[PDB]
From a paper:
Consequently, trypanosomatids possess multiple biopterin and folate transporters with salvage pathways to convert them into the reduced cofactors 5,6,7,8-tetrahydrobiopterin (H4B) and 5,6,7,8-tetrahydrofolate (H4F) by means of pteridine reductase 1 (PTR1, EC 1.5.1.33) and the bifunctional, nicotinamide adenine dinucleotide phosphate (NADPH)-dependent enzyme dihydrofolate reductase–thymidylate synthase (DHFR-TS, ECs 1.5.1.4 and 2.1.1.45, respectively)., PTR1, a broad-specificity, short-chain dehydrogenase, can reduce dihydrofolate (H2F) to H4F, thereby circumventing inhibition of DHFR-TS. Whereas DHFR-TS enzymes are restricted in their substrate repertoire, primarily reducing H2F to H4F, PTR1 can reduce numerous pterins and folates.
The ultimate validation of this novel screening assay was confirmed on demonstration that compounds identified as actives using the new assay were in fact legitimately binding to TbPTR1. We have shown, using cocrystallization studies, that an example small molecule identified using the screening assay described here binds to TbPTR1 through interactions within the pterin binding pocket in a manner similar to that observed for MTX. The binding mode of the ligand is similar to that observed for MTX bound to TbPTR1, with the diaminoquinazoline ring of DDD00066641 sandwiched between the nicotinamide ring of the cofactor and the side chain of Phe97. Two H-bonds are also formed via the N1 atom to the α-phosphate group and from the N3 atom to the nicotinamide ribose 2′ hydroxyl. The hydrophobic toluene substituent packs against a hydrophobic surface formed by the side chains of Leu209, Pro210, Met213, and Tyr221. Routine cocrystallization studies with TbPTR1 across these series have repeatedly confirmed the binding mode revealed for DDD00066641. Furthermore, the structure–activity relationships developed and informed by data generated by the screening assay conform well to the binding modes identified for multiple series through similar cocrystallization studies.
Numbering used by the authors:
A (entry chain C), B (entry chain A), C (entry chain D): 2 to 103, 113 to 142, 152 to 268
D (entry chain B): 2 to 103, 113 to 142, 153 to 268
């Protein structure tokens, strides 16, 4: 029968492309969302039109809190509930915004940026492993972590922690046959609130084609890592950045 | 005027070694502690008998919470209260224990391991910089972050986030003339509860001398980074590991 | 028209598996070899029986010398002579043997280890680019490059230069639409001369499955990197090591 | 008696500052050079004026060839002949020029860039070790993962040097020989480069919008050879003003 995958923040943009490609590959999917209910259900409707009862949605805030472990457990449980199995976890949901060192309170920013990018991946990783073939986890990382955007220290700390989790969980879960890997975009789908001139500044920086990655190109790397063609691969983070991280200042 | 330094978790072990060496170099010191009140007071007494009014203690829990920003702000405030300046911050205090993926609640484990190793350094860094010559911050990292101990994922995530901080904060605070660097021990002071046979198993693995780093050897690298001999150094992490991280399985 | 690929050191082992999978994928192939003449011709025979006129052999020594540039030129030329095009270069051929610091002269050891692992890849890369779809190069690197085997300094130097080449050529050849990537094995096909107790000692070290990578599992990663599913990927090295590089001493 | 150090390419620029600082720390020095005889001799005279019989020059081409192993052995031998001991080796000499992928022949560019940056350090390390606070410091490059366009052989040479630093650290540790690296970002700029282009680069550096002095590079070499770094091996210290942290 068909394997099942959980994709966090799967309603729009990159998580959406990932869930679509996984479904096209033959997976049943849990579309996790926080604020984007309409979009999440729209995607489920589309996927279920293709193959009946192969997509469900699951709401959760992934901000760090007292209830986050229970929320993460429920995300995994919804996959087992809907499909009787959970073969793939994709940690894609992510808050992204500046937190200058020199109005959300700083402790809220910690909760959101560190929660979404690191603690929730950790808790979902725990629950995914506890509840257990070709099982794997794919973490959406960031190819630019060592050359970070100015004033994004919390966001960067979140993504660095996710690298640590990817590595630690690969080592620890290997005995269980659970592989744990990452995909590290450089520039992909650009901010909605970014202006067109600024977009082109960034595009011009990419050696391979002077363009951002499509969400589908990011999804392609996820598809590889979950597949039978990556069965010896664990603890690896694959850059999908058109060479951007190689470009000096 | 003598410069002043804050060392977190400075009552014993490596934090103490760093405070002492800074003091011997001519720094006035804030000895931060959490539980080790007797040892912190004792160390301060010792340093003050060497030079009068050159050391004060400062108690704070560095577990993550909504009050952690205020606590970190107060730690920096206490350096200015005592000495009228704050030249150096050393982020040494650190929780370290296993958190298996498959007692304390996971919420507490997250708060302690991520708070001490990452969030408190980030908040102390904000406060140190907000309050502002040879200014710098040294973060105590871990040379083994890419070959972590089994079942230490939250601890590892915390140390990886600290690397991210070191880099982000080096970039962002360079315009202010604040350098931000790391020292990464491999095996130094062994756990107090560890049996001699287990200690020797680890000692035997170290290429350079088959022994752990002394606390002073760790302090030596910290003292270099804060000195005028490191005035162009920022965003660097110096391994003090005797070659351990180079040794394959 | 079918695309064409050069695989160096393709007569046996991992190189052979790569040549076989490329061919199965629809590529015409140049089977480069040095001494394994019989095995190279035998492979070409096998592949040509499957689809006629889709495989040729090409002999060359890839040791560093003044004629190495011309030899590398001729390898690329042989691909054009046979197939009219050259879409993919796989830098697989590699000398591997200890060279302690404390019958071959050191001059020969340098020429062999640095020539095969670094200079030949570099010269092949020049020639490939100069003769110029989905064009790409895949370099066979080494996951253990930062945790090297004792007394393998020249080999390790070679593999390190190979990473540098992958990055530098990714950046420079991007404007030409040539992607440059790496696949980094941990332990795969074991040395011929190695005895069985020693083989099993190394197998025990691999977290994922306690065994070495098949040559086909290595080839699988090469296949991905050259595919249309990796079209935004350049300057990336994918570890295929079962988590081995994550294991501390 | 005083310890002794060999510094390669020590006649000028960064290697010169390294030799001067080592000398000021109390080392006797072998000032190796290739083409800069007048500058090397001028340095030796300055140092010997300071302390009699504490500096000698040693000429050698560090390009890769059949004779390079013998030349490197002779450089180490020179330190023993002058001073009776060799405590420190600094691998500083380096060829640096573009080699685009698309009058020197490429085999000569390989020989010069790979020989000076990698093979010569390896042979020198062998010779240094066969003869034995002992340490080796290799001059690396902080920008090796964000390389300059069309510098592939140079970049290959420096990556090879990181491999050597790690491999030799591991292998010579049982002998009490530590092996480390100093990785400048931008330090002393080419003499020929117009100020307009120098300042373009200077402005990229987060920490003070300037290049490293040769003396600041030397300071990190001085730390690594000192008693203060006695547990440090296989480490490479960036001295780059934050440059490698700056995205495109
Ligand atoms: N886009 C890029 O150029 C780029 C570059 C580097 C790395 N990446 C990584 O790739 C991944 C996807 O990128 P993206 O641009 O598609 O992401 P995105 O648009 O910024 O966000 C993806 C989703 O994250 C979910 N999310 C945010 N905060 C949440 C919270 N507190 N709780 C639960 N869910 C939350 C949101 O779901 P709802 O809409 O349902 O609220 C959002 O739609 C991220 O991990 C990102 O860091 C992207
Ligand atoms: N020891 C090693 O071999 C080694 C290896 C790698 C890295 N390191 C790094 O080097 C640094 C020092 O090592 P160490 O072994 O000396 O450290 P440690 O003894 O394990 O901890 C140092 C201090 O951290 C403080 N701390 C713990 N939890 C705290 C909390 N919730 N709030 C405030 N303070 C808290 C404690 O202060 P109180 O005693 O006052 O409660 C403790 O004395 C650490 O950052 C460590 O990660 C050490
Ligand atoms: N566990 C592993 O096997 C492992 C681990 C890490 C990395 N890797 C990397 O993966 C690749 C394949 O591994 P492998 O074990 O299959 O390699 P290998 O069998 O040791 O060597 C591959 C071929 O390289 C060719 N070669 C050697 N010296 C040459 C020279 N001077 N000139 C021209 N060709 C020469 C030989 O060709 P002829 O037989 O025709 O003479 C040989 O068959 C290598 O790059 C290796 O470094 C392998
Ligand atoms: N300058 C920078 O911004 C920078 C940046 C990153 C890394 N670094 C590293 O720091 C080190 C010092 O840099 P630098 O700018 O001072 O170096 P440099 O001036 O470019 O070269 C130093 C010396 O290397 C010697 N050399 C060149 N080719 C040689 C050969 N074939 N055989 C023997 N010696 C040869 C030359 O000696 P003669 O003059 O006697 O012929 C030259 O003076 C180098 O390893 C370099 O890669 C420097
Ligand atoms: C030029 C440029 C391209 C893409 C983004 C960008 C947009 C959204 C976004 N979301 C996120 N959770 N994480 C990111 N790293 C991210 C990055 C920003 C700037
Ligand atoms: C063999 C061995 C050597 C040293 C430690 C060790 C002891 C205490 C300790 N505290 C800490 N905050 N962080 C560490 N990384 C740490 C590590 C553990 C095991
Ligand atoms: C345990 C163990 C597994 C595999 C090899 C091994 C065998 C052949 C081999 N060839 C080569 N060109 N490069 C390597 N790194 C290599 C490695 C050595 C030791
Ligand atoms: C802008 C700019 C910055 C630094 C150099 C520079 C000058 C000389 C130089 N020599 C050398 N052996 N290695 C280098 N990496 C180097 C670099 C050149 C141009």
């Amino acid at each position: 029968e068909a394997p099942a995958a959980v994709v966090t923040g799967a309603a729009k943009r990159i998580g959406r492309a990932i869930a679509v490609k996984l479904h096209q590959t033959g997976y049943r999917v849990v579309i996790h969302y926080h604020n984007s209910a309409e979009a999440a259900v729209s995607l489920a409707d589309e996927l279920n039109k293709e193959r009946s009862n192969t997509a469900v949605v699951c709401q959760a805030d992934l901000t760090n809190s007292n209830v986050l472990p229970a929320s993460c457990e429920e995300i995994i449980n919804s996959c087992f509930r809907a499909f009787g199995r959970c073969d793939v976890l994709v940690n894609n949901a992510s808050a992204f915004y500046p937190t200058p060192l020199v109005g959300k309170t700083v402790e809220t920013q910690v909760a959101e940026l560190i929660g979404t990018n690191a603690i929730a991946p950790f808790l979902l990783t725990m629950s995914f492993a506890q509840r257990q073939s070709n099982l794997s986890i794919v973490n959406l990382c960031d190819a630019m972590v060592d050359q970070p955007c100015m004033a994004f220290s919390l966001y960067n700390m979140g993504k660095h922690a996710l690298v640590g989790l990817t590595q630690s969980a690969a080592l620890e879960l290997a005995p269980y046959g659970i592989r744990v890997n990452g995909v590290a975009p450089g520039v992909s789908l650009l901010p909605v609130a970014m202006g067109e001139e600024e977009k082109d500044k960034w595009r011009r920086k990419v050696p391979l084609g002077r363009r951002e990655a499509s969400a589908e190109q990011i999804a392609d790397a996820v598809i590889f890592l979950v597949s039978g063609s990556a069965q010896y691969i664990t603890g690896s983070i694959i850059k999908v950045d058109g060479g951007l991280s190689l470009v000096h200042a």
